């Protein structure tokens, strides 16, 4: 509309209405110029055997993008508590996005002193990739999302993508994308932008823990009418072979017939937080579970959803089977264990095999008068008819959705880092500053213009999500476990700022507190 | 409308709908001040015999102009592929042009440091020459067109024209044009400009190759009922004259009667890309085919459409009979052969004579008992009744249309560099910055003001063309030749940017892949 009028307002809050909760977040952003308005080809710079798994080919673009795909973007710690203590499940419904109060600044630097002024006629370009025609980078747990704390101003991350590569070289099948070749809306300082999005139907995330285990579903007072083989020999001696059968009952619950079995496993190596218990060797990469694709090895991370550890042992964690978050101010490389937060999937032990254990045993031969029965350990087990399992939990710091790859087939497309898998997830929102050239020469030149005015933009983003709730119906008599704050005195309030104004998140918070019968 | 509102959006894409394809391109431009707001008379500065062919007289203007007349302005490489593999022909239908988001910048340079600021009250003037009253420069294969890659910012070329000249002097018949003497629209930063244009009916470009040759149209199993003269003598000796006649048939297809003959020729000198095969002398200009007009010699370039070379010989090319494009970053003068891309017209061999060959032989005398039959080579042949020919192909880098000169007569007005000839082509679009004078003296002076504020403008151009398609109907059993990318690994993707952000076009791409029966 105009230079002196505001194109939007600040909306941050949650509205709890019945079975719906509506969250709204507003943040202030800053967008630089990336790559000097250039598309640039990029590839791994390394050589040798080590480079092999790390090889890539792709492009970086002048564009930035908006990422709201973490939960702490949309929920305060109190709202997340209010969610996870009272509800058995939740899921996103609608999405509403706004971009407003756009300001374009020009920077003239002379003799080491820089001046910043408004450029009132400059534009910023924005479009959403509604047709999912661009490579989709939002499901890779990247940085650059809206900050959890509403008072922080954040920088918009640069967009880039990878295409097919052989080592660091490309192939004829590799694709190049100009983002200028999409239609986009152009905004001066009075203009604003919005769009709305509709989540496709997904299952409720299961924010509850089971109060029964898959192997304990029987009535503890009654026998089965099934029999099992109790004895193959009468005793010590020669030629003692016999067949004896017993009823499965309360005394022996391990041999009873069951209708359902625990879910699939891919074994992880077990690491202790007590370092003297670990082996004195480097086994981080060498001893890691991995999968290979076209010759390259990828770590299995986090992998299939499995219980992090056995009951009573919390000092162990899967080598690359858990999500690990950094504490506030944690460095990038080779930080100690107290600098990171290792989450655990202990709640899913009821239906899921432990990550660091074998699935079970199988017979490896035929026993005979000349051959003893032999067994072997099942290190990995794929889906069997009759398996039941839980997905990975979601966290306040963790991702919300992922894009399901477009393929002939998939199974249980729920994404492995947690959250909601979608064939049409929330679309990517691309933004860049329109280049403003400096003064051209006075005689014509056919070369493209490499001289521009140094420029950046800033503004406000609001995002609104409607969430559907699934309320707890339980008949449990005794009280539940709840997520709660601790009363003990401390130098800081958790989930607040410190004396320097730095907001931190003390610990990762999962979703599973309330219980359900298995 | 306003300073803080945007006057247009960014539209780039193609829409393939049935028999129509609609392309839309948006670019960012920069317009300087040319000639210090002056019209200036210009003429060749050279003297001597060499100057004769190069003599000219004309004017340069303060105005710039917009040129979208190359195909890579409107088509991406993938769209051009999608066009040429699937279609027998195409042609333009409608045109829509927009000019928006205008910014005028003033440059104040003090002590070697220059400041750039917005001048919000300045205007830019624009008009289209709808009545074709200006000299038309768009059909001369000039530089300054919108860049093929949408992310590049381009400088607008300066407008100028030539009028009648005798050497470097003018004549009374020479015309002068003030472009200020047209009505034009004036635009401040909130204003925008548009117009729409309707292509006049042109034939479809023939984007196909013939799967038959003009001389092979007979049924290979059957004789003709026509006779030809097989023998004029019985054998060796004296007085052996006779007349013998044979049937033309499968055994001798060269002597058969035919209804149609190949098209016209003007012979070109043949040059090899293997330099040891070429003569050790300078023959580029001296050995070139030319035409003379009013005493001046013009190279025949590219000339009539003729097959570039005989089958099996691709190392030869016509001396000035082909279009030659430069590779990205190629210098202006005396570049090597690997720096340029020589296109070929090998597809049209079926109906057209080879450029470097004679058309044929004619009888030069009357044979008699005292005189042997004599023949001579036809170096150039004009139109004959019964000729058929193909036009020159169009390229992704090549021109789209030309203006047919306004004359009493023309023949097959299709332009010789390729594309669509039109009596009313897309009009010229002229643009200049309105001069803003600096402070005048405080006492009156009648001289025109020579002191101005240094100023330039920038903005966005979008152009939209609707193209009509002619779909391939063929009954051919075996598969076609298609244009395709090569799978082999390379350091760069073709038709992409490199690591420095430079977009290049690897090779020229013609239109002729699908085949038709002759």
């Amino acid at each position, epitope marked *: 509309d105009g230079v002196g009028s505001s194109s939007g307002n600040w909306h941050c809050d949650s509205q709890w209405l019945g079975d719906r909760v509506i969250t709204t977040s507003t943040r202030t952003w800053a967008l630089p110029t990336y790559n000097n308005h250039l598309y640039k080809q990029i590839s791994n710079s390394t*050589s040798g*055997g080590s480079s*092999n798994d790390n090889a890539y080919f792709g492009y970086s673009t002048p564009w930035g993008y908006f990422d709201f795909n973490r939960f702490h973007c949309h929920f305060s710690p109190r709202d997340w508590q209010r969610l996870i203590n009272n509800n058995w499940g939740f899921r996103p419904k609608r999405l509403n996005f706004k971009l407003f109060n756009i300001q374009v600044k020009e920077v003239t630097d002379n003799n080491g002193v820089k001046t910043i002024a408004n450029n009132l006629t400059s534009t910023v370009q924005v479009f959403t990739d509604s047709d999912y025609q661009l490579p989709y980078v939002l499901g890779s747990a990247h940085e650059g999302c809206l900050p959890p704390f509403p008072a922080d101003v954040f920088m918009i991350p640069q967009y880039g993508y990878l295409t097919l590569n052989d080592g660091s*070289q490309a192939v004829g099948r590799s694709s190049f994308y100009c983002l200028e070749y999409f239609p986009s809306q152009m905004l001066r300082t009075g203009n604003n932008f919005q769009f709305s999005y509709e989540f496709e139907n997904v299952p409720f995330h299961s924010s509850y823990a089971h109060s029964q285990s898959l192997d304990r579903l029987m009535n503890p007072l009654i026998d089965q009418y099934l029999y099992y083989l109790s004895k193959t020999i009468n005793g010590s001696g020669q030629n003692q072979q016999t067949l004896k059968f017993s009823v499965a009952g309360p005394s022996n619950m391990a041999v009873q017939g069951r209708n359902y079995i625990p879910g699939p496993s891919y074994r992880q190596q077990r690491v202790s937080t007590t370092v003297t218990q670990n082996n004195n060797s480097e086994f981080a990469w060498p001893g890691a579970s991995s999968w290979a694709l076209n010759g390259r090895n990828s770590l299995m991370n986090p992998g299939p959803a499995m219980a992090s550890h056995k009951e009573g042992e919390d000092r162990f964690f899967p080598l690359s089977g858990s999500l690990i978050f950094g504490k506030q101010g944690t460095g990038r490389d080779n930080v100690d264990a107290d600098k990171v937060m290792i989450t655990n999937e202990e709640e899913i032990k009821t239906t899921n095999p432990v990550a660091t254990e074998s699935y079970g045993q199988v017979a490896t031969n035929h026993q005979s008068a000349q051959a003893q029965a032999q067994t072997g350990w099942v290190q990995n087990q794929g889906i069997l008819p009759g398996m039941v399992w839980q997905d990975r939990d979601v966290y306040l710091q963790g991702p919300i959705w992922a894009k399901i790859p477009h393929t002939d087939g998939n199974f249980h497309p729920s994404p492995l880092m947690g959250g909601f898998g979608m064939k049409h997830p929330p679309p990517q929102i691309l933004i860049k500053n329109t280049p403003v050239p400096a003064d051209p020469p006075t005689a014509f030149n056919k070369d493209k213009l490499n001289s521009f005015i140094t420029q950046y933009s800033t503004g406000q983003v609001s995002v609104e999500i409607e969430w559907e709730l699934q309320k707890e119906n339980s008949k449990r008599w005794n009280p539940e476990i709840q997520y709660t704050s601790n009363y003990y005195k401390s130098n800081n309030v958790e989930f607040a700022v410190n004396t320097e104004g730095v907001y931190s998140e003390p610990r990762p918070i999962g979703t599973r507190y309330l219980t359900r019968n298995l | 409308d306003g300073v803080g509102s945007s006057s247009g959006n960014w539209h780039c894409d193609s829409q393939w709908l049935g028999d129509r394809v609609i392309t839309t391109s948006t670019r960012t431009w920069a317009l300087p001040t040319y000639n210090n707001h002056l019209y200036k008379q210009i003429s060749n500065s050279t003297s001597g015999g060499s100057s004769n062919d190069n003599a000219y007289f004309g004017y340069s203007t303060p105005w710039g102009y917009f040129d979208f007349n190359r195909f890579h302005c409107h088509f991406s490489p993938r769209d051009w592929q999608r066009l040429i593999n699937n279609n027998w022909g195409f042609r333009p239908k409608r045109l829509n042009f927009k000019l928006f988001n205008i910014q005028v910048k003033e440059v104040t340079d003090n002590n070697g440091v220059k400041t750039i600021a917005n001048n919000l009250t300045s205007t830019v003037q624009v008009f289209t020459d709808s009545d074709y009253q200006l000299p038309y420069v768009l059909g001369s294969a000039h530089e300054g067109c919108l860049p093929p890659f949408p992310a590049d910012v381009f400088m607008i070329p300066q407008y100028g024209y030539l009028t009648l000249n005798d050497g470097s002097q003018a004549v009374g018949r020479s015309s002068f044009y003030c472009l200020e003497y047209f009505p034009s629209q004036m635009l401040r930063t909130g204003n925008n400009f548009q117009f729409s244009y309707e292509f006049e009916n042109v034939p479809f470009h023939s984007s196909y190759a013939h799967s038959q040759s003009l001389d092979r149209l007979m049924n290979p199993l059957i004789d003709q009922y026509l006779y030809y003269l097989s023998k004029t003598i019985n054998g060796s000796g004296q007085n052996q004259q006779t007349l013998k006649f044979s049937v033309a048939g499968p055994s001798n297809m060269a002597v058969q009667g035919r209804n149609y003959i190949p098209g016209p020729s003007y012979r070109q000198q043949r040059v090899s890309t293997t330099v040891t095969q070429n003569n050790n002398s300078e023959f580029a200009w001296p050995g070139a085919s030319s035409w003379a007009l009013n005493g001046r010699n013009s190279l025949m370039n590219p000339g009539p459409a003729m097959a570039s070379h005989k089958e099996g010989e691709d190392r030869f090319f016509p001396l000035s009979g082909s279009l030659i494009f430069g590779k990205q970053g190629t210098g202006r003068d005396n570049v090597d052969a690997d720096k340029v891309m020589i296109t070929n017209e090998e597809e049209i061999k079926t109906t057209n004579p080879v450029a470097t060959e004679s058309y044929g032989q004619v009888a030069t005398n009357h044979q008699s008992a005292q005189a042997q039959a004599q023949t001579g080579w036809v170096q150039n042949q004009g139109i004959l009744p019964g000729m058929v020919w193909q036009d020159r192909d169009v390229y992704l880098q090549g021109p789209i249309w030309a203006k047919i000169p306004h004359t009493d007569g023309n023949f097959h007005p299709s332009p010789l560099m390729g594309g669509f000839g039109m009596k009313h082509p897309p009009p010229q679009i002229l643009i200049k910055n309105t001069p803003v004078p600096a402070d005048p003296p405080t006492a009156f002076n009648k001289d025109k003001l020579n002191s101005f504020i240094t100023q330039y403008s920038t903005g966005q151009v979008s152009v939209e063309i609707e193209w009509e398609l002619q779909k391939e109907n063929s009954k051919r059993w075996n598969p076609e030749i298609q244009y395709t990318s090569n799978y082999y690994k390379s350091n760069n993707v073709e038709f992409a940017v490199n*690591t420095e952000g430079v977009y290049s076009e690897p090779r020229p791409i013609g239109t002729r892949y699908l085949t038709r029966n002759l």
Partner: antibody, heavy 119, light 107 residues
Framework: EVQLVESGGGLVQPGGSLRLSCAASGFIFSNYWMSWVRQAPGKGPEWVAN????????HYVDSVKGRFTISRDNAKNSLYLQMNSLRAEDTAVYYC????????????WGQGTLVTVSS | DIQMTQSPSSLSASVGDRVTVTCRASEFISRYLNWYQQKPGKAPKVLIYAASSLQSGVPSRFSGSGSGTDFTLTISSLQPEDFATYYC?????????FGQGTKLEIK
């Protein structure tokens, strides 16, 4: 089939600068990483530098960092090693090698040129 | 960087004998280990690359085994042509490093 030729070897006083050129006729030169390997007299060979198949990146051994520049011309299929501030230790036979695709070993080696740094 | 240690530094055997050379790596270099045979006045020639795999055109008597930090070069049915200096090189990371070398002697 695949041939690598090294030229420019010779004797130079310390602090001197020398340039070495490698010619490759047998393969697609732009698909491969190329290395420089030196073997001092009576010693095992030693890796000096490698450069990317397009020349975007390059690596050098610590001892020679800043004094040597590896360079690649893909159109001429030639590899160049630029040596500055030469030392007595530097004198060795210089080998031009091609790094194998995927495996990364030196599948092909040039004959090599002896380069002497003498007082 | 990574250090490569080759043992024994020198070895002497006779035609028909079985010879084994051991290479050790300071850090994990996976399967990227090569064995080069070198004769005076010539460049090193690759015998075995990527741990186990044998170079084409090389006799089947040369064999290689091992992964991670320990590798071994095995020669069965030794031949007069086999006497040379042998190097183990790691191509896992830069700077690429070579072993000290094992020299074989006629007996």
């Amino acid at each position: 089939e695949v041939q690598l030729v090294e030229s420019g070897g010779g004797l130079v006083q310390p602090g001197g600068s020398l340039r070495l050129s490698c010619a490759a006729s047998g393969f697609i030169f732009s698909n491969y990483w190329m290395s420089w390997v030196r073997q001092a007299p009576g010693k095992g060979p030693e890796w000096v530098a490698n450069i990317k198949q397009d020349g975007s990146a390059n690596h050098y051994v610590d001892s020679v960092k800043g004094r040597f520049t590896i360079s690649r011309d893909n159109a001429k299929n030639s590899l160049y090693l630029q040596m500055n501030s030469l030392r007595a230790e530097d004198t060795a036979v210089y080998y031009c090698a091609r790094e194998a695709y995927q495996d990364w070993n030196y599948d092909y080696w040039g004959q090599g040129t002896l380069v002497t740094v003498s007082s | 960087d990574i250090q490569m240690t080759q043992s024994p530094s020198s070895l002497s055997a006779s035609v028909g004998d079985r010879v084994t050379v051991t290479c050790r790596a300071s850090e994990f270099i996976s399967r990227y280990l090569n064995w080069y045979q070198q004769k005076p006045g010539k460049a090193p020639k690759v015998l075995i690359y990527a741990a186990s795999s044998l170079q084409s055109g090389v006799p089947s008597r040369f064999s290689g085994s091992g992964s991670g930090t320990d590798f071994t070069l095995t020669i069965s049915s030794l031949q007069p042509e086999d006497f040379a200096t042998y190097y183990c090189q790691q191509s896992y990371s830069t700077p690429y490093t070579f072993g000290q070398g094992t020299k074989l002697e006629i007996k």
